[PDB]
């Protein structure tokens, strides 16, 4: 009833003053600068605040993004852009890059970078809930929702905003297309993990569970692959997590697939399926150790005992023994040589990311207030 989600560190940024000195001339332009500065500061604080919930994040985030949106969007022409886009330099670290910062003087860069941190916050809020031994039903649902929210933010950043950046991200950086895509995919896989647990707890047909498990594994595999063109040094830890989870959930698939075969009086085949489940599980059991010995971003962990990791282990043995027992007095069936092949159905959509858009430009931005800027120095 608990999950373990590897998390990379949050991004950090230089505090930004929004002080333009002689540029800004007027009470109104000054006020909007203070409101930007303070809304940003409050938002940044929430990322590390333990009392923060999804409501506060959205509330603080909207407050900032709506003000920040005045540096990006035109007030009238949808084909134009704020004259203020380049007024302010923003500086950010990157998820795989440690403390090595990167900077752009582009307000669009800030919007994507901060939004990316908002998305990560949601994945970290989810993973914190997923680790509570006492996690309740509502908390699990929130884990699922939060990951879907995160998926949608990352994706929105990628599709409609990333292409505005005049300096593309360097390989391995958070604002790059390939990396950001892996986060979307991982979120889906992680969120689908929660779904599977409910289906299992709720006693759903084994065909459904097996298929959902298999699709979950596939997502993890795609994420693993998506990152695979990165330098191995700083991706190695993360890819180990994804690959471990991939192997781990394939075992889940073989396990529940065995039930389907056994229920069909194909018990010989069922036994063979469970044997493959043991293998996949052992591979996962090996990979989860390498992760613990592999250096890279985030705290060190040694995945074996998670209530999730051990349950599949008990399920596999009991499900395997059940099959062979049936085989010994009932079926008397041969154990096939080759592992069974997996269905690969189309998407079930249970994993659809919740669409995200930034809020509209704050109504504090008016042509008069905007007029109180630049003036040319």
């Amino acid at each position: 009833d608990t999950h373990w989600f590897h998390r990379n560190p949050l991004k950090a940024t230089a505090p930004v003053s929004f002080n333009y000195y002689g540029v800004v001339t007027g009470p109104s332009a000054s006020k909007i600068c203070n409101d930007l500065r303070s809304s940003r500061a409050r938002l940044l604080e929430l990322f590390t605040d333990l009392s923060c919930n999804p409501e506060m994040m959205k509330n603080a985030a909207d407050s900032y993004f709506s003000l920040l949106q005045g540096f990006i969007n035109s007030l009238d022409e949808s084909t134009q852009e704020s004259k203020l886009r380049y007024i302010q330099n923003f500086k950010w670290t990157d998820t795989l890059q440690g403390q090595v910062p990167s900077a752009q003087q582009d307000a669009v860069f800030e919007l994507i970078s901060m939004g990316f941190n908002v998305a990560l916050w949601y994945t970290k809020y989810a993973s914190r809930l997923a680790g509570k031994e006492n996690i309740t039903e509502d908390e699990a649902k929130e884990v699922h929702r939060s990951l879907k929210i995160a998926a949608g933010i990352f994706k929105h950043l990628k599709e409609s905003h990333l292409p505005k950046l005049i300096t593309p991200a360097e390989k391995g950086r958070d604002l790059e297309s390939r990396l950001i895509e892996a986060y979307v995919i991982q979120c889906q896989a992680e969120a689908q993990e929660v779904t599977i647990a409910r289906a299992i707890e709720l006693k759903h047909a084994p065909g459904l569970i097996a298929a959902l498990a298999y699709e979950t594994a596939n997502f993890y595999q795609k994420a693993d692959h998506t990152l695979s063109s990165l330098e191995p040094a700083y991706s190695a830890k993360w890819r180990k997590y994804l690959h471990l989870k991939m192997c781990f959930y394939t075992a889940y698939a073989y396990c529940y697939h065995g039930e389907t075969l056994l229920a069909s009086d194909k018990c010989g085949e069922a036994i063979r399926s469970l044997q493959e489940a043991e293998k996949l599980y052992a591979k996962a059991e090996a990979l989860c150790k390498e992760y613990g010995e592999t250096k890279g971003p985030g705290p060190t962990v040694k995945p074996s005992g998670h209530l999730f990791f051990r349950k599949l282990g008990n399920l596999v043995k009991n499900t395997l023994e059940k099959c062979q027992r049936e085989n010994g007095f009932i079926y008397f069936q041969k154990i096939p040589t080759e592992a069974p092949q997996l269905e690969l159905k189309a998407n079930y959509g249970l994993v659809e990311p919740i669409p995200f858009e930034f809020p509209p430009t704050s109504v504090q931005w008016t042509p008069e207030t905007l007029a109180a800027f630049d003036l040319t120095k």
Partner: peptide, 18 residues
Amino acid sequence: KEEEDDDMKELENWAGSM
């Protein structure tokens, strides 16, 4: 047989809530 389909809904509703 057909049970698998019936169940599929119960998840869609659980997930399609929030």
